[PDB]
Design a protein around this nucleic acid. Structure first.
Ligand SMILES: Nc1nc2c(ncn2[C@H]2C[C@H](O)[C@@H](COP(=O)(O)OP(=O)(O)OP(=O)(O)O)O2)c(=O)[nH]1
Ligand SMILES: [Ca+2]
Ligand SMILES: [Ca+2]
Ligand SMILES: [Ca+2]
Length: 341
DNA sequence: GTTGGATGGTAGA
DNA sequence: CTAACCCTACCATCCAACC
């Protein structure tokens, strides 16, 4: 079993660089402009030049400009990056129809039947990087291993523009030596819970009673970690099927007023109902980010498919339900459809 | 017991 | 308006309806 994983380098900003090659070699910051004030919103991503100075995904545009005023600030153009991504995913598909598109910028290929061994896998890696460079001028990192988890880890170790194999031997070694916080799926909350226990390595999860582990981090994560430590992990590459599709938007200002909020919710419903594209949902959820950034939602599952009209009607109800039960003002409002027929 | 719906938490893009 | 956007996957918990 051999998995090749592809993850595009500083994606949104690299696309902008390809579109406008004069930007290459200099700082580039792609931004989500909330419209609340002069330069409100967050950085979606930045090129390596900008990251040198602490500008990265997630920080507020004004914070980025405080540390890099001279940089080039471009507004996120999601549709453009999705079109470049699709062209890339289809090139990848020529290397293996057995492909799992995991996100806007990354994909797992099962290549067990394209290559005999890791050295051939590595070579196909080199070919992939070249095709994507010839055809779309986008550099990418490649990670190759026996499974998804370690292929992802491998690419994390190779960024940017890299290529890493983690073979059966180094998987053994990493199980013993890799900080467990570097395992995909282990964020801040879990990592702090593991350290309290004294679990620092995947191998540690084997020297602890299951129920005390499951008691601290939940069953599923614990099962997953043990699986990895035993080297018995093997979740197959599967064709991506979207389980939910939604839209969320930021308001010019915070409100509790239904009439002040409706235009945003309706903007988001229209945009959502359009991304559905022949998919028919049975559940709708109205999602509200509050004053203090706490996320709050109200939903309904119907026994049947929701028409756009039903969606209009029910979301307004749901929104009112939020207002009725949470006494805080709202700052972002959206809607998410799920349970496709 | 099982299934699944409502709602929130965690993670990562 | 004074910093914090966008989108999706998965799981846990507290439930109720089932039989
Ligand atoms: N709006 C928004 N978009 C994000 C965020 N994080 C990532 N993205 C988008 C923009 C990125 O270019 C794209 C891929 O994200 P990645 O995590 O892979 O990092 P990126 O590709 O930018 O460079 P990376 O591989 O480190 O070199 O997804 C975020 O917090 N907000
Ligand atoms: Ca990525
Ligand atoms: Ca990337
Ligand atoms: Ca981590």
């Amino acid at each position: 079993g051999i998995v090749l994983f592809v993850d595009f380098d500083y994606f949104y900003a690299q696309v902008e660089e390809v579109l406008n090659p004069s930007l290459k070699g200099k700082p580039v910051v792609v931004c989500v402009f909330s419209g609340r004030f002069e330069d409100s919103g967050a950085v979606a991503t930045a090129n390596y030049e900008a990251r040198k100075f602490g500008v990265k995904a997630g920080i507020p545009i004004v914070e980025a400009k405080k540390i890099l005023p001279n940089a080039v600030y471009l507004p996120m153009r999601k549709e453009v990056y999705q079109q470049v991504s699709s062209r890339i995913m289809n090139l990848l598909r020529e290397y293996s129809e057995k492909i799992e598109i995991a996100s806007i910028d990354e994909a797992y290929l099962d290549i067990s039947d394209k290559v005999r061994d890791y050295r051939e896998a590595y070579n196909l890696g080199l070919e992939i990087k070249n095709k994507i460079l010839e055809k779309e001028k986008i550099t990418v990192t490649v990670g190759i291993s026996k499974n998804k988890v370690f292929a992802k880890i491998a690419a994390d170790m190779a960024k940017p523009n890299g290529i890493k194999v983690i073979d059966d031997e180094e998987v053994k070694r990493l199980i013993r030596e890799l900080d467990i916080a570097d395992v995909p799926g282990i964020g801040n909350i879990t990592a702090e819970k593991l350290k309290k226990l004294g679990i620092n390595k995947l191998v540690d999860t084997l020297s602890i009673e299951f129920d005390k582990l499951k008691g601290m981090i939940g069953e599923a994560k614990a099962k997953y970690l043990i699986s990895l430590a035993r080297d018995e992990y093997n979740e197959p590459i599967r064709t991506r099927v979207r389980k939910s599709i939604g839209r969320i938007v930021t308001m010019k200002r915070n409100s509790r007023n239904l009439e002040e909020i409706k235009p945003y919710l309706f903007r988001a419903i229209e945009e959502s109902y359009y991304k559905l594209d022949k998919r028919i949902p049975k559940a709708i959820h109205v999602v509200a980010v509050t004053e203090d950034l706490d996320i709050v939602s109200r939903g309904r599952t119907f026994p049947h498919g929701i028409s756009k009209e039903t969606a209009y009607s029910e979301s307004v109800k749901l929104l009112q339900k939020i207002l009725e039960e949470d006494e805080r003002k709202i700052r972002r409002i959206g809607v998410r459809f799920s349970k496709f027929i």
